[PDB]
Amino acid sequence: SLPPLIPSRTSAPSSSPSTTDPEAPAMSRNGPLPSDVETKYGMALNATSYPDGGIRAATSQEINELTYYTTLSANSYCRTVIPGATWDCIHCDATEDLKIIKTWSTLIYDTNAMVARGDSEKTIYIVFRGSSSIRNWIADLTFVPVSYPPVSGTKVHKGFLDSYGEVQNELVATVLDQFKQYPSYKVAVTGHSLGGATALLCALDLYQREEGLSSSNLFLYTQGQPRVGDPAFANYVVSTGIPYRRTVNERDIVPHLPPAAFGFLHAGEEYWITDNSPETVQVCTSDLETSDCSNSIVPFTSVLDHLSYFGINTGLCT
Ligand SMILES: *[C@@H]1O[C@H](CO)[C@@H](O)[C@H](O)[C@H]1NC(C)=O
């Protein structure tokens, strides 16, 4: 039923430059945290202030695009959207012309996902919701590295791989049915929080199984996404060439979990929201994460900064 893995697309790159830990300079320079501040994996849950190749500023059009995908991610937390399959929610005006093809709410791992299509913008959308109990999800997070089965020599966190696997077979079949019908359309994947992890694994699976998808027509946007796998996994993600915009809001803790020092590493160019008034996004123009954007503020992180992106509530349908 799933199309088979394509060998040329499931090979780890032969030799990758080593990456030094991108959080270590900040972990040494910053601190100590105030005594009363709670931590998870050494990162603050509730710090309320900042501590004492290249970077650029995102343009208005780039910020509009990141905002649109944030909106899709946010609306997925609304039960009128998943499993209701309606555009009846407060930020649903921006997505109301999209046709909802299918939604899922899986049994064991509670993966909530949807496929939609926009004929005006010639795009097939895949959206993954994060946890329905975010604070408990963050507090309860483990780090259990396991083999990433498609790509030998790579590892990912088991919970993330499990979240995707439960919805994978049906969702791939729905996406590829849409892509057969609308062959010139873009495929765009998005999610916030845990949903961003799931979205990454979904984009990789579609690249690995459908020759007709590539860097030209398969795009990934995440918000508040945790690290998903080890440096060999991140180097594999880079190798795919998939366009990958990874947005981080200010001091959001979740992009810093699990910490880099625990042997995980992000791929995907970082778009760091540094200010809402005026809206400012600092882009660290590297495919592997750097010490120059949100990694510069650890461990002075925040759960509250995870719960809104671009002034849109992310994780709460309000
Ligand atoms: C953080 O959480 C702890 C536990 O609830 C509390 O004792 C502390 O005042 C909080 N600190 C800040 C700066 O919010």
Bridge partners, residue 309, by sequence = 312
CB neighbours of residue 223 within 10 Å: 35
**Could you confirm whether 60 is annotated as catalytic?**
no
Take residue 277 and report the two structure tokens written for it. Answer: 């008034």
CA-angle at 167, arms to 162 and 168, nearest 5°? 85
**Is any ligand 1 atom within 6 A of the Cβ of residue 52?**
no
CA 114 from chain center: how many Å? 15
For residues 159 and 144, the answer to whether their CB atoms sit within 8 Å is yes
Question: How many Cα neighbours within 13 Å face the side chain of 312?
Answer: 25
Structure tokens at 141: 């997070």
**Technique used by the depositors:** X-ray
Neighbours of 13 (CB within 10 A): 11
Helices (H), the chain: 24-29, 60-75, 134-140, 158-181, 194-209, 231-240
Instruction: Work out the number of other CB atoms within 10 angstroms of the CB of residue 117.
Output: 17
Nearest 10 degrees: Cα torsion 20, 26, 32, 38:
-80
Tokens 């895949």, residue?
Answer: 126
267, 213 Cβ separation under 8 angstroms: no
- Taking the centre of ligand 1 as the mean of its atom positions, its distance from the CA of residue 44, in whole angstroms, is 10
Residue type for position 280:
T
* Euclidean distance between CA atoms 21 and 269, whole angstroms: 16
Query: Does the annotation count 266 as an active-site position?
Result: no
Experimental resolution (Å): 1.5
CA of 302 to the centre of ligand 1 (A): 11
CB neighbour class for 73 (10 Å; exposed up to 12, middle 13-18, buried from 19): buried
* Spatial contact of 269 and 285, defined as CB atoms under 8 Å apart: yes
CA atoms of 224 and 227, how far apart (whole Å)? 10
- In this structure, the chain runs to a length of 318
By C-alpha distance, which of 272, 240, 232, 239 is closest to 255? 272
Report the nearest atom of ligand 1 relative to the CA of 47: 13
Evaluate the omega torsion of the peptide bond into residue 278 and state whether it is cis, within 30 degrees of 0: yes
- Cα 206 from Cα 3, distance rounded (Å): 10
Asked whether the bond before 299 is cis by omega within 30 degrees of 0, the reply is: yes
Task: Provide the pairing of β-strand 218-223 with 244-249.
Answer: parallel
Q: Is residue 46 in contact with ligand 1, taking CB distance under 6 Å? A: yes
Going from the C-alpha of 59 to that of each of 56, 62, 65, 215, 269, the distances in angstroms are 9, 5, 10, 22, 15
Q: Are 260 and 21 in contact (CB under 8 A)?
A: yes
Q: Residue written as tokens 């750097």? A: 290
Q: Is the dihedral of CA 293, 268, 61, 130 positive or negative?
A: negative
Burial class of 190 by CB neighbour count within 10 A (0 to 12, 13 to 18, 19+): buried
Tokens for 2, please give them. 């799933």
Distance from residue 301's CA to the centre of ligand 1 (Å): 13
Q: How many CB atoms lie within 10 A of CB 166?
A: 18
3-state secondary structure of 207: helix
* Rounded Cα gap, residues 256 and 264, in angstroms: 10
Q: How far apart are CA 238 and CA 156, in angstroms?
A: 15
CA dihedral 96, 86, 117, 210 (to 10 degrees): 150
CB within 8 A of 236, min separation 6: which ones?
12, 13, 151, 154
Residue of 35, 37, 305 with the most ligand 1 atoms within 8 Å of its CB, for mutation: 37
Q: Is the CB of 119 under 6 A from ligand 1?
A: no
Active site residue 205: no
Q: In what order do the strands lie in the sheet with 244-249?
A: 55-57, 279-284, 269-276, 244-249, 218-223, 186-192, 123-128, 112-118, 99-105
Q: Tell me which residue of 127, 107, 104, 126 sits closest to 176, measured CA to CA.
A: 126
Side chain identity at residue 194, one-letter code: L
- Enumerate the β-bridge partners of residue 190: 127, 221
**Ligand 1 pocket, 37 CB below 6 A?**
yes
Q: Which atom of ligand 1 is nearest to the CA of 36?
A: 8
- Which of 144, 154, 146, 149 has its CA nearest to residue 232? 154
Other CB atoms within a 10 A radius of the CB of residue 198 amount to 34
Q: Is the bond into 231 cis (omega within 30 degrees of 0)?
A: no
Annotated catalytic residue within 73, 230, 306, 308: 306
A 10 A CB-CB count for 162 gives 16
Q: What string of DSSP letters covers 183-205?
A: TTSEEEEEEETHHHHHHHHHHHH
State the pairing for strand pair 43-44/39-40. antiparallel
Residue ranges of domains in the chain, CATH in brackets:
7-313 (3.40.50.1820)
Decide whether any atom of ligand 1 lies within 6 Å of the 38 Cβ: yes
